[PDB]
Ligand binder design. Structure first.
Ligand SMILES: [Zn+2]
Lengths: 50, 1130, 50
């Protein structure tokens, strides 16, 4: 999967419990400019993560 | 078949309840309630107009002594004489100043006016049943008259429809934009509050901005957060509201609830030492300063916060807060499940205006304008002069007269269709139009219209397509008086507060109970079902004094109990199902006692068998579609239903009840059949020889005998709309194709489907012209008194009355291509002379006239055949009409064959075992098997001729015969469908449409042929016809068609320099503009249309100069050419 | 999908993710979160748009 995005550019009919989030995700103002790295440790039983 | 009998019982009259004619009853009452009761309440007022000092010096206006009286002549006299039919209303007005004194009340008169003897108010009066009005309590009824019309100033009959109100009973939801929604509603005062107050509110919610969840209005209320407003009104914590809004909600709505509550809490904490009262007061004061209100802050605040919800005036604030909370709950639910919330086009959220409501609203508005004008005049007089003098000529024109006249003229607020001139096409129209309901501009067939409106009766073309509906025969619209309203509301409230004392104060997890949208309590959820059941039982026993109260239980997740009592609601009867038990089936005495009881008797003596249900209650109930289907279910299944429905024939309107077996045909044919049923010629009027009006009348009528019950109770059958004729379904020499028909000459000669057309003519003449003493060729039908002679036939150039302008005849002329006989003449002499003439002409069928059956098989006369040219059967019978058989089966009109079969069966045996005339029941929406009808026909024929072979009996049952060719007297190959049927003649006549023009008048501006069939106009050659001519390649033809006539040519010169048309002075062509500039340009002749010159001159007037050049190609010479062959080498 | 949404969110402060195989026919994605101020308002918004 590569970065394919969406912008406020035919009509759709979603279930309206998903449509709220779907339309929220179309606004570029809701995304940070740079990735926010993880900070809470997990998967302690593996070194492949490093 | 008990359900059918109970249904029939509603259609017949009920004298004990005052119902003399069911189809129009609800309209009569609607008007009677206005003229007798509501007008008095509206007019009888005693109000302050201005105040001075401090509530101790005020002017007061009072109106009293309201009296209404009817005319002294009958409506037929009004029609003949040309008068109007209006009741007269008079009242007394007093204007007086009052000064509050410690000693009591001080009164000082200023002015007083009376209308004891004056046309102070003229109110159009409703003719009603039997030409009887509500004011006159006479004891004579004109038979075969149902009324429902008005007569206006010019003696023209008017008739109206019903209209859907603009204000809805449910809030409207709208998606303003992605994740941004609104919820708007209205509040109105109860009926007994004069004048009426209105408020419109809007709630806005945006996911991006949850702190601005705001309720607002226009210049009447503050813009505030709805949660905080609810806290202010109800004095409850935010956690209480959180728990309330999420008690029984799906988990996806609870997240939005939490977000909203947290945003409200954040707003609360953003201010130092928050106080709800201070917050509201600061908002109010900011609004006060923002506006330029001159009132004190206390007055402004009291006005704002006391008139918050007009429909809930005089109730504590906590109930208003809980009402706001319930509205918010519904808003959120509709946000997440939109399709499960009532749509804006649903009939669940609308009410309907009847005849009397138009008058009520106009009276309200005019009275308010009257008082406003009086106040303004008094204020101006005080400002300029002194002593507070009230000018005259402002308290003598209440303005109701012009309001009512405009109402009858066809204007009502933003609508222009409430009333119209009655088209006298058919008798049944007097039922059809007053039972129509019109909607504001929705064209789709919404499910909520089913079972209360006719499925098939709607406009088929034009701008009204899908905007006008027709009530079903069992539907009605409610009426109620103010005192009845108050008593009913009081009884309901007392019942609630008495029988449920301990369980009506939940307010957090309960079901709110509203009466006309006004919250009065909140019920414990565990007891909802009982409350409803016990309520309905008490409703059916007459406990509340009214059997039409509506109660709705909304449970999806909105959790409400709604009670409706107001006027304008659609109601029908239903069969009751109680605890999985159909009550009709557990009442043995009813079957034996039914024949001797009326509908109200059944309601009184056997309650719980039938219940009156309105549309909102119907939409939220579980209803079994038929009794037969109910009986086939198990008891557990039966326990899920609240009601059972009547047979399908009661779901059609009165117009559709004229058709037979519409559910055996394609639906489009049903729409067409409803359309053409209203155009069939009937016994239009008992006053055929008295009324001076347009009309068409059937000459030798017959009563149909294959009918439904509704057609009989409404009296449509008794007034007739056709004749029984003998038809054959076959091809006649290839002549009757594409819906053409053959008709028999001798049938026409003897009076078959003969009609009479009647027309009204009216002229006004100056007295000098009428009395002028000169014989022009157009006065050959006049008597010595200057009026047309009785029983004379007028032609297309004759005048009806002498009208000479002084030595020139300037009279109007008769302009029909057929003659007519003078039946009646009426003359009024005044400053002018008014002449009215009624003429008649009989019109036997001719080529091109239009006919149809009751299954929508329409056609025109294609050939008139002599009796000796038609095929005949063994008894010597020849058909009156021949219709091509193919169209019966390609259009799938099966019920026509069944109708013919049953008509023949009736003819064989038309009487009962008692010898009484016995009609055959074949309803629209039939439900009876074809085999049963065949068995009935077989029994009829076996009674007729006991000795018939099997083949002969089969032929008689199926209406098949051998026919013989009259030219050779030999049989045709196969048998032909042949028999009697009720046939209709339609109002489209050939000689009413034919037109021709040779030469005539022209329009002045463009000099082209004028328009109008009655004015000798010409047909328009449009641009699509021009396209076709160009497609043919006929250039000269189109050029000649579009040019001016060759006989209208003249010499016209144009200046080649500036383009002006050259003038001709003393016989010399000259360009004035160029001559003034000392130039000598060329002048050239042009051959163009007059309209081109007008267009160019107007373009010049707009400042555009148009210059034309001309071609001067050098001369050319012909040269011999060498020969060419072009053939191939073979 | 989940990780890309959480990483660029403007209302998430600290986060971590892990995945578990509940059984032969279920997968559990676990997210540990701490939101920016205000806390509960952003919590509700996140649960609404996820
Ligand atoms: Zn010129």
């Amino acid at each position: 999967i590569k970065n394919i995005g969406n912008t406020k550019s035919e009509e759709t009919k979603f279930e309206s419990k998903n449509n709220i989030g779907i339309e929220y995700s179309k606004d570029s103002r809701n995304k940070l400019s740079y990735r926010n790295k993880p900070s809470i440790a997990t998967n302690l039983e593996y070194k492949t993560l490093c | 078949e008990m359900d059918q009998r109970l249904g029939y019982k509603f259609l017949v009259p009920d004298p004990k309840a005052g119902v003399f004619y069911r189809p129009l009853h609800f309209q009569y009452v609607s008007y009677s309630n206005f003229i007798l009761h509501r007008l008095h309440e509206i007019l009888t007022v005693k109000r302050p107009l201005l105040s001075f000092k401090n509530n101790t010096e005020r002017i007061m206006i009072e109106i009293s002594n309201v009296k209404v009286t009817p005319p002294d002549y009958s409506p037929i006299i009004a029609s003949i004489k040309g008068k109007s039919y209006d009741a007269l209303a008079t009242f007394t007005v007093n204007i007086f100043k009052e000064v509050m004194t410690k000693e009591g009340i001080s009164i000082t008169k200023i002015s007083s006016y009376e209308g004891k003897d004056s046309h102070l108010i003229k109110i159009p009066l409703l003719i009603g049943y039997g030409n009887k009005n509500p004011l006159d309590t006479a004891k004579y009824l004109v038979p075969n008259v149902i009324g429902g019309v008005f007569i206006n100033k010019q003696s023209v009959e008017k008739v109206g429809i019903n209209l859907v109100e603009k204000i809805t009973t449910w809030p409207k939801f709208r998606v303003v934009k992605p994740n941004s929604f609104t919820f708007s509603f209205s509040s109105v005062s109860p009926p007994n509050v004069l004048p009426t107050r209105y408020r419109h509110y809007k709630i806005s919610l945006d996911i991006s901005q949850l702190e601005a969840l705001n309720i607002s209005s226009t210049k009447t209320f503050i813009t505030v957060n709805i949660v905080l407003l609810s806290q202010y009104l109800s004095r409850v914590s935010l956690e209480f509201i959180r728990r309330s809004l999420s008690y029984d909600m799906p988990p996806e709505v609870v997240y939005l609830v939490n977000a909203i509550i947290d945003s409200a809490k954040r707003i609360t904490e953003s201010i130092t030492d928050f106080n709800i009262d201070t917050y509201i007061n600061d908002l109010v004061e900011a609004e006060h300063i923002k506006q330029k209100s001159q009132l004190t802050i206390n007055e402004f605040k009291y006005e704002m916060l006391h008139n918050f919800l007009p429909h809930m005036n005089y109730t504590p604030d906590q109930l208003k807060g809980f009402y706001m909370i319930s509205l918010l709950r519904k808003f959120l639910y509709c946000i997440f499940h939109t399709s499960r919330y009532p749509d804006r086009d649903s009939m669940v959220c609308h009410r309907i205006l009847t005849y009397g409501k138009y008058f009520e609203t106009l009276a309200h508005d005019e009275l308010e304008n009257y008082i406003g004008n009086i106040r303004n005049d008094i204020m101006n007089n005080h400002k300029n002069r002194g002593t507070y003098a009230v000018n005259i000529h402002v308290l003598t024109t209440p303005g109701l007269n012009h309001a009512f006249s405009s109402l009858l003229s066809g204007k009502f607020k933003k609508s222009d269709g409430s009333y119209r001139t009655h088209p006298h096409y058919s008798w049944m129209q007097n039922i059809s139009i007053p039972r129509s309901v019109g909607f504001y501009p929705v064209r789709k067939y919404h499910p909520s219209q089913y079972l209360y409106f006719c499925s098939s009766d709607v406009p088929e073309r034009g701008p009204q397509v899908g905007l006008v509906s027709q009530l079903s025969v069992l539907s009605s619209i409610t009426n109620i008086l103010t005192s009845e309203y108050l008593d009913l509301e009081k009884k309901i409230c007392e019942y609630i507060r008495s029988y449920y004392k301990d369980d009506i104060s939940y307010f957090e997890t309960g079901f709110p109970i509203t009466i006309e949208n006004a919250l009065v309590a909140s019920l414990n959820p565990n007891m909802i079902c009982d409350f409803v059941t016990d309520f309905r039982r008490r409703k059916r026993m007459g406990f509340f004094g009214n059997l039409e109260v509506g109660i709705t239980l909304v449970r999806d997740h909105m959790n409400e109990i709604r009670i409706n009592i107001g006027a304008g609601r659609l109601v029908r009867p239903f069969l009751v199902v109680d605890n999985g038990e159909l009550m009709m089936d557990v009442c043995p005495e009813l079957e034996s006692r039914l024949d001797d009881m009326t509908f109200s008797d059944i309601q009184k003596e056997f309650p719980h068998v039938i219940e009156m249900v309105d549309i909102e209650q119907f939409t939220f109930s579980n209803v079994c579609e038929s009794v037969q289907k109910f009986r086939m279910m198990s008891k557990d299944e039966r326990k899920q239903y609240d009601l059972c429905d009547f047979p399908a024939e009661f779901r059609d309107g009165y117009v559709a009840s004229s058709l037979v077996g519409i559910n055996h045909n394609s639906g489009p044919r049903a729409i067409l059949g409803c359309a053409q049923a209203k155009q069939a010629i009937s016994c239009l009027s008992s006053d055929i020889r008295n009324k001076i009006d347009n009309g068409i009348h059937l000459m030798y009528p017959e009563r149909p005998i294959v009918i439904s019950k509704a057609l009989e109770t409404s009296k449509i059958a008794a007034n007739c709309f056709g004749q029984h004729v003998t038809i054959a379904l076959m091809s006649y020499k290839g002549i009757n194709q594409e819906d053409g028909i053959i008709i028999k000459k001798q049938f026409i000669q003897r009076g078959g489907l003969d009609i009479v057309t009647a027309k009204k003519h009216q002229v006004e003449i100056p007295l000098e012209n009428f009395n002028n003493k000169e014989r022009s060729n157009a006065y050959s039908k006049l008597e010595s008194n200057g009026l047309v002679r009785l029983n004379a036939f007028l032609e297309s150039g004759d005048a009806m009355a002498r009208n000479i302008s002084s030595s020139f005849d300037v009279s109007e002329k008769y302009t029909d291509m057929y003659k007519s006989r003078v039946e009646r003449v009426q003359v009024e002499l005044t400053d002018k002379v008014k002449v009215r003439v009624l003429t008649m002409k009989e019109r036997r069928p001719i080529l091109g006239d239009k006919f149809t059956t009751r299954t929508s098989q329409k056609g025109t006369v294609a050939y008139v055949a002599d009796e000796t040219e038609l095929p005949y059967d063994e008894n010597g019978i020849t058909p009156d009409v021949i219709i091509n058989s193919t169209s019966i089966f390609s259009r799938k009109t099966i019920s026509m064959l069944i109708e013919v079969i049953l008509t023949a069966a009736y003819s064989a045996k038309p009487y009962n075992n008692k010898g009484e005339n016995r009609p055959v029941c074949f309803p629209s929406s039939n439900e009876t098997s074809i085999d049963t009808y065949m068995q009935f026909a077989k029994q009829c024929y076996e009674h007729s001729n006991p000795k018939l072979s099997d083949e002969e009996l089969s032929d008689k049952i199926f209406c098949e015969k051998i026919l013989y060719d009259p030219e050779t007297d030999k049989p045709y190959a196969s048998k032909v469908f042949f028999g009697p049927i009720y046939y209709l003649r339609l109002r489209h006549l050939t000689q009413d449409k034919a037109t021709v023009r040779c030469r005539g008048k022209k329009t002045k501006l463009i000099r082209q042929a004028n328009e109008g069939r009655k004015r000798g106009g010409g047909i328009k050659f449009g641009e699509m016809e021009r396209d076709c001519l160009i497609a043919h390649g006929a250039a000269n033809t189109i050029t000649e068609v579009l040019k001016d006539s060759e006989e209208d040519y003249q010499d016209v010169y144009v200046c080649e320099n500036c383009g002006d048309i050259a003038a001709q002075i003393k016989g010399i062509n000259t360009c004035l503009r160029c001559s003034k500039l000392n130039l000598s340009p060329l002048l050239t002749k042009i051959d163009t249309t007059h309209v081109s010159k007008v267009f160019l001159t107007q373009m010049n007037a707009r400042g555009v100069k148009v210059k034309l050049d001309f071609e001067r190609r050098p001369p050319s010479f012909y040269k011999p050419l060498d020969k060419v062959d072009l053939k191939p080498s073979f | 999908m989940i990780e890309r949404f959480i990483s660029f969110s403007v209302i998430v402060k600290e986060w971590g993710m892990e995945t578990f195989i509940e059984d032969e026919d279920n997968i559990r994605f676990t997210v540990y979160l701490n939101f920016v101020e205000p806390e509960e308002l952003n919590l509700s918004k996140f649960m609404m748009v996820l």
